[PDB]
Amino acid sequence: SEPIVLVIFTNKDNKSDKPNDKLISETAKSVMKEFAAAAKELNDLEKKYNAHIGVYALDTKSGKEVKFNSDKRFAYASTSKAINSAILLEQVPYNKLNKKVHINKDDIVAYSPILEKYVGKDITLKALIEASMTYSDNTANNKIIKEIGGIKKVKQRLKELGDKVTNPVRYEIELNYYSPKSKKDTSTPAAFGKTLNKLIANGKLSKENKKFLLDLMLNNKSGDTLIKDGVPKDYKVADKSGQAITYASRNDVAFVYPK
């Protein structure tokens, strides 16, 4: 069971529009229909929800790809939490994840339901990753980026994986201030999806780290209305969702195991 990598980014034309998660659900249902040997058009779904859909899906076994506006730019929001987690896990073995880092008042950013209790305390790298992936803790993600070496280093690792599209510029929460006239903190579905395959599904993580990460993603409840909602029952979905502040920017990325 090699997974299918699925990236769905959506947005709407107005700053203050609100997303409908059912759009991603329905998107996921249709695209998955493409991987068997019948399905609504993605166009019709854009019409039905009055929204823009960007999709990239790769069956890592066969190589087959499904693309729809696969090269348009979208704000990725908290879906980058997965990328940042993974990058740190390329560099720290499972058994050294009990290493502790000091958290102080200056590290704290908005929406840190886990980390706000550790001000002035030490937390392990594992709990950081848990916080970031399961609770979408913004302080945890920022500390993770710092542990990797800064935005600086993330950007250089993406270049090494051959992603010259994903453009990280700000930390949480400012990365969520998406503007369609700026490339800041955007990627395209194809770039991001290819990066997720090369970092996680088919990357250099150890089996323990890979497992640890994917377990977080499988057990995350924040994506139940999204791709998880759309694929049949029988499929395991490990996801990381996101939503930016503007233009109803609502996204989900996942590894889909049809078995």
Spans of all domains in the chain: 1-259
- Please check if 240 is assigned to a binding site: yes
Alpha carbons 51 and 47: distance in angstroms, whole number: 7
- Please check if 16 is assigned to a binding site: no
Residue in the block written with tokens 């994506």: 223
Taking the C-alpha atoms of 199, 203, 204 and 207 in order, what is their torsion angle to the nearest 10 degrees? 100
Experimental approach taken: X-ray
- Please check if 242 is assigned to a binding site: yes
Residues 6+ apart with CB under 8 A from 226: 8, 21, 24, 25, 28, 239, 241, 252
Quickly count: other Cβ atoms within 10 Å of residue 41's Cβ. Answer: 10
Q: Answer whether CATH 3.40.1030.10 is correct for domain 1-259.
A: no
Active-site annotation, residues: 78
| Resolution for this experimental structure (Å) | 1.8
